[PDB]
């Protein structure tokens, strides 16, 4: 039930150079798709394990 748009919006906001008000939800979800294919960083992955 969790819509992940908030996560990508936070990510883009913390990059500090983009204006998220100009970024549509479709682009945020395409970013989500690209992020979802990446492996987790080792420390974070071990903590989650």
């Amino acid at each position: 039930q969790k819509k992940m748009k908030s996560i990508v919006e936070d990510f883009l906001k913390r990059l500090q150079i983009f204006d998220i008000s100009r970024v549509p939800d479709d682009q945020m979800y395409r970013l989500r798709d690209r992020l979802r294919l990446l492996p987790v960083e080792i420390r974070r992955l071990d903590i989650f394990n």
Binding site: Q1, K2, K3, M4, Y29
Partner: protein, 49 residues
């Protein structure tokens, strides 16, 4: 001419009943949360979440 024998009848009917019209008013109808609504293929109608 009026003839009593030829005019006397027994009329039969039901003692009492109630007629109803709105059949669907007897049905309690809920829906799932739209986030969980599925299509004919049993997957969520919208899956980009």
């Amino acid at each position: 001419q009026f003839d009593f024998r030829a005019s006397m009848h027994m009329l039969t009917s039901n003692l009492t009943f109630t007629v109803y019209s709105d059949l669907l008013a007897f049905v309690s109808a809920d829906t799932v949360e739209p986030i969980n609504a599925v299509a004919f293929d049993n997957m969520r109608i919208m899956n980009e979440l």
